[PDB]
């Protein structure tokens, strides 16, 4: 998955390092690879990565680089 999410341009997308995405995975506006493209649109709103309730609770402000 490290090389997968990375091959789909998530590593530092809108100021969010790969570790944040790999951790988020662990714990029609999009009009629908498909999951990543939609997440990119979701993170662009006023919430950021906090749109994923689990990311705030378990990944936001931890050693996220440990996931990669």
């Amino acid at each position, epitope marked *: 998955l490290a090389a997968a999410m990375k091959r789909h341009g998530l590593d530092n997308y809108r100021g969010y390092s790969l570790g944040n995405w790999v951790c988020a995975a662990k714990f029609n506006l999009c009009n629908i690879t498909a999951s990543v493209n939609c997440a990119k649109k979701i993170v662009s709103d006023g919430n950021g990565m*906090n749109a994923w309730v689990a990311w*705030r609770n378990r990944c*936001k*402000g931890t050693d996220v680089q440990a996931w990669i």
Partner: antibody
Framework: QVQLVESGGGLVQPGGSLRLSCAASGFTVSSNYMSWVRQAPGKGLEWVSV???????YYADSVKGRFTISRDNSKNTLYLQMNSLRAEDTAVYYC???????????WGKGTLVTVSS | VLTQPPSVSGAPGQRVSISCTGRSSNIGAGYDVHWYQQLPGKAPKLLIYGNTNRPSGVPVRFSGSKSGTSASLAITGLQAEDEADYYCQSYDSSLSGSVFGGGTKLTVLG
């Protein structure tokens, strides 16, 4: 060893501007979530703004358009630019470092900002 | 906003729980709740974090719990040294940032 020392507090006139500095040590601000939380005399706590490790910035609706959070990665300093200041903004402004899930982990000693004529 | 009772007046040795009533936008969504203790003339200190965990140095008697749309902080064997202002904190999503409760003035009877 983790120290958060804020400065820049004092008297400002209504509609005036002020900038707060937070000199950090014992850790790096470029690798951490950094926030400002205020407290008006004898009142509750209020989240002002946050700066993410990757540069993302968020603000409370009460300060949006007037305040700006920023940092100096080289100087290891956190800033808060405050414009168009009202008497409502009179508060002790604490520099904060976030732990897990935007919880506050370390607080500064606080700096009091007074808005009056 | 998160809501807490202005007070709570409790007895020494007796257990107490402080309520943090949320909304669908904060606790209802499933965002973890953190608790702070604030002594007079001092800055707040992280007591409980999301929503049960304790940081290094907080006594085992301080506990946290989350019930769907709300949360509570419990103190087993209350001491006079617990007379402080207590705050709950979560993330509001319509507001797009951290949100704090009104605060609770803990009183030790006796």
């Amino acid at each position: 060893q983790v120290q958060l020392v804020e400065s820049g507090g004092g008297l400002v006139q209504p509609g005036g501007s002020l900038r707060l500095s937070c000199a950090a040590s014992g850790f790096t601000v470029s690798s951490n979530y950094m926030s400002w939380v205020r407290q008006a005399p004898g009142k509750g706590l209020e989240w002002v703004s946050v700066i993410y490790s990757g540069g993302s910035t968020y603000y409370a609706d009460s300060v949006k358009g007037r305040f700006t959070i920023s940092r100096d990665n080289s100087k290891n300093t956190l800033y808060l630019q405050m414009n168009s200041l009202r008497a409502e903004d009179t508060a002790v402004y604490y520099c904060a470092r976030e732990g897990p899930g935007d919880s506050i982990d370390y607080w500064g000693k606080g700096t009091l900002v007074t808005v009056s004529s | 906003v998160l809501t807490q009772p202005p007070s709570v007046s409790g007895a020494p040795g007796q257990r107490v729980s402080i309520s943090c009533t949320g909304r669908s936008s904060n606790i209802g969504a499933g965002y973890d709740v953190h608790w702070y203790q604030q002594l007079p003339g001092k800055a707040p200190k992280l007591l409980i974090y999301g929503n049960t965990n304790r940081p290094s140095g907080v006594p085992v008697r301080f506990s946290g719990s989350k019930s769907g749309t709300s949360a509570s902080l419990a103190i087993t064997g209350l001491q006079a040294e617990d007379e402080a202002d207590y705050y709950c904190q979560s993330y509001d999503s319509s507001l797009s940032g951290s949100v704090f409760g009104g605060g609770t003035k803990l009183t030790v009877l006796g």
